[PDB]
């Protein structure tokens, strides 16, 4: 592809520049190029990949929600709202497919540390979840199952291999709880997971790490905020 001729180190460098310039589509392209070199990503590099694609898909989800709301309200009319919602939807699905493709073809492996394996399986769950937000019919049930299965595998590893305050473990649990509440229509499972996650993190607060405690405490608060919203 388009990044084939560029050195890995140069792609990482340009991803960082694109982040500074708030050029997230470019950032995502650079990081895809870096992934396709076929070497593992470090923690910091996984962050770049994550930030880039989350920004791109986040803009699409926000746009999709606006248009879907106009559409639903207009179904209480020409084809234009539906057409444009479908256009944005198609682009969103394409970005999710790209991410899921990278995860499957390059990033998800049996080897590597717990952090990397959990992070990538969390990411697989997230991008299936984003597909599930716009899916209908047959496709939707399948997508939801794929999301659940990725999250559950990530959860199994995180509980065995990571401290209960680890930010990836916490972020995974937060996102899985959101899946349960918003996607799978299982509020009780959502509440239970979020409560267990928060309580176990507090009980072993001493496991906070010097280099990530700010991220941990932020996710702990987001768990508490959802618990307040859901009860």
């Amino acid at each position: 592809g388009a990044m084939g001729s560029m050195e890995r180190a140069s792609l990482i460098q340009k991803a960082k520049l694109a982040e500074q310039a708030e050029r997230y589509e470019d950032m995502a392209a650079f990081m895809k190029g870096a992934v396709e070199k076929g070497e593992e990503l470090s923690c910091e590099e996984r962050n770049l990949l994550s930030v880039a694609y989350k920004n791109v898909v986040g803009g699409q989800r926000a746009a999709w929600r606006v248009l879907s709301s106009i559409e639903q309200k207009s179904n209480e009319k020409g084809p234009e709202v539906r057409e444009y919602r479908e256009k944005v939807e198609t682009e969103l699905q394409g970005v999710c497919d790209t991410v899921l493709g990278l995860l499957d073809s390059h990033l998800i492996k049996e080897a590597g540390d717990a952090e990397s394996r959990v992070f990538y399986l969390k990411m697989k769950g997230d991008y299936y979840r984003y597909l599930a937000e716009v899916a209908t019919g047959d496709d939707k049930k399948r997508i939801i199952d794929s999301a659940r299965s990725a999250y559950q595998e990530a959860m199994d590893i995180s509980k065995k291999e990571m401290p209960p305050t680890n930010p990836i473990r916490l972020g995974l649990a937060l996102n899985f709880s959101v899946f349960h509440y918003e996607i799978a229509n299982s509020p009780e499972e959502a509440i239970s997971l979020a409560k267990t996650t928060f309580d176990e993190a507090m009980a072993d607060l001493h496991t906070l790490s010097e280099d990530s405690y700010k991220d941990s405490t932020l996710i702990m608060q987001l768990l508490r905020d959802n618990l307040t919203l859901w009860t």
Partner: peptide, 10 residues
């Protein structure tokens, strides 16, 4: 109000 997921924070 949607549930909050993991933020895109560096």
């Amino acid at each position: 109000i949607r549930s909050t997921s993991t933020p895109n924070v560096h």
